[PDB]
Amino acid sequence: PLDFTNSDVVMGALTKAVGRLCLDVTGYDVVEADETIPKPEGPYILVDLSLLTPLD
């Protein structure tokens, strides 16, 4: 009954948090690296989770 939010939930929600703030400020369009699509029209931003570091 003592539940929580495991790693998978936090990691996936961090991308969307970055995605919304980029859209809401710059006014550009957003896209991730996870799946490939034909290049959109107009300015846009690409998001990628390049690296991840643990603390021992």
Partner: protein, 142 residues
């Protein structure tokens, strides 16, 4: 104007092949991304008559089974002459490249994705040449 080439051949055998068009769509309701949960929509069709031929050389990238650090991966390709019009992907749109189903070196059947299409707009006769690469095993391409 061309006359002989504007008609179907009567010496070399030709076969028909199956194909399928491809689009994509966004599924996630709240994700702010154009990608969302991408999905592909298919609509089948066939080519009137086609000729299939393999790569001519033996270059290391044209071999069928390739040794990688994971395991003996798989690769195939072809060159096709056809009288049907097939389209590649176009940017700023939701259309993807057409695919068509052909036999492979492992004895099965798999989908090949159109990569290069050749046309002669000034001649008039509808004869085309395509270059195809087999979809990665276990996926539906991109």
């Amino acid at each position: 104007a061309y006359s002989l080439l504007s008609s179907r051949n009567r010496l070399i055998p030709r076969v028909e092949v199956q194909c399928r068009k491809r689009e994509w769509v966004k599924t996630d309701p709240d994700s702010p991304f154009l990608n969302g949960g991408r999905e592909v929509l298919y609509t089948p069709f066939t080519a009137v008559e086609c000729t299939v031929q393999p790569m001519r050389g033996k270059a290391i990238r044209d071999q069928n089974n390739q040794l990688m650090i994971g395991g003996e991966e798989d690769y195939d390709s072809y060159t096709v002459y056809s009288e049907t019009l097939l389209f590649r992907a176009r940017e700023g749109t939701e259309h993807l490249s057409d695919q068509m189903l052909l036999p492979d070196s492992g004895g099965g059947q798999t989908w090949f994705t159109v990569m290069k299409a050749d046309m002669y707009p000034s001649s008039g006769v509808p004869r085309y040449r395509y270059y195809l690469i087999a979809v990665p095993v276990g996926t539906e391409g991109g």
